Amino acid sequence: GAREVKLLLLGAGESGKSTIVKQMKIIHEAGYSEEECKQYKAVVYSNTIQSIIAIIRAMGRLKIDFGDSARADDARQLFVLAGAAEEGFMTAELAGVIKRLWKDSGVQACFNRSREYQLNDSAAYYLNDLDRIAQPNYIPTQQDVLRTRVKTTGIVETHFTFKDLHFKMFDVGGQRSERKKWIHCFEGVTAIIFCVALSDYDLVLAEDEEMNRMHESMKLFDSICNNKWFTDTSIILFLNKKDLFEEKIKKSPLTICYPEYAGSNTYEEAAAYIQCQFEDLNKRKDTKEIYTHFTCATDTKNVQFVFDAVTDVIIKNNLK
Amino acid sequence: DIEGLVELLNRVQSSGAHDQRGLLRKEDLVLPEFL
Ligand SMILES: Nc1nc2c(ncn2[C@@H]2O[C@H](COP(=O)(O)OP(=O)(O)O)[C@@H](O)[C@H]2O)c(=O)[nH]1
Ligand SMILES: [Cs+]
Ligand SMILES: [Cs+]
Ligand SMILES: [Cs+]
Ligand SMILES: [Cs+]
């Protein structure tokens, strides 16, 4: 008989929860048609602008000057043009201002210090493709739509059949949900897919945080993991953003996030170390098992593959 | 439990890592102080 498989996505903002959801529609659903991709132009541009602005704002706080002082006019002009360009379209004027700002060594200098502030991980993706994106005959591709960033009004979800199972994937995130909603989200869970942004290991801590992003995520995992209520619940761990991690580990040591770390600075050892920090949180290595996968939420191929395995674990953890 | 707190603190407080979300709104346009 058909089983309802209630999947709950958990994890800090930016961990990739929303992105896994979209991957499900592309893989186990229809995906996005052209009539529907065209629909995202407005957001693709909205996001592109918000990104260059996030960086421009960062230059102020961090006091990083433009490689060329002319850019100050562009920056000031960025905010006017932006707040004046009908959504969905981008003029040859705005495209220029952005291209010049993104090209500035001062701005690139600030971009390289994104660890000191909060820059979404789509800024690079879009700012580089300005050539394509800016052209007026532009049609967002699937990967373009996958990288977008929209509204989490309430709770996001998707229904899809895979290996004859009725998958219901849930994802809250930002939407303050009370013990009400929460208890109601947990009740019925078949598997919790906990997302972690590996690349967050080098983030400078905020003025409010006692511990860093990683350890805050570690803390939450700990609870979800060792909570008797989720005993029979399959606990999949997605150590996401491995591409950014690999790119980063090169320049920024893991000792930033785990001062005691003494291994080498290879994607391999650093990654293995983080996999242990999370899995050692498990208080019943005998009782429960953690299903860890290093992934790249934005990679449809890898996600399809990884979700293929998660299902096997679900298909049989149901002791059958 | 505080569990509800932690989840609201980790999955929310970082969604800020994206005041960069949704369509463009007047708030995200306020010209930076270093004007
Ligand atoms: N480069 C890269 N970006 C990613 C990856 N996973 C998620 N992202 C991006 O990082 C952000 C996290 O977004 P999602 O939209 O997944 O929101 P979340 O559920 O709050 O963490 C988005 O900008 C994604 O496009 C990944 O593996 N690699
Ligand atoms: Cs299907
Ligand atoms: Cs499609
Ligand atoms: Cs200068
Ligand atoms: Cs960066």
Ligand SMILES: [Cs+]
């Ligand atoms: Cs490119």
Ligand SMILES: [Cs+]
């Ligand atoms: Cs839906």
Ligand SMILES: [Cs+]
């Ligand atoms: Cs559906």
Ligand SMILES: [Mg+2]
């Ligand atoms: Mg979010």
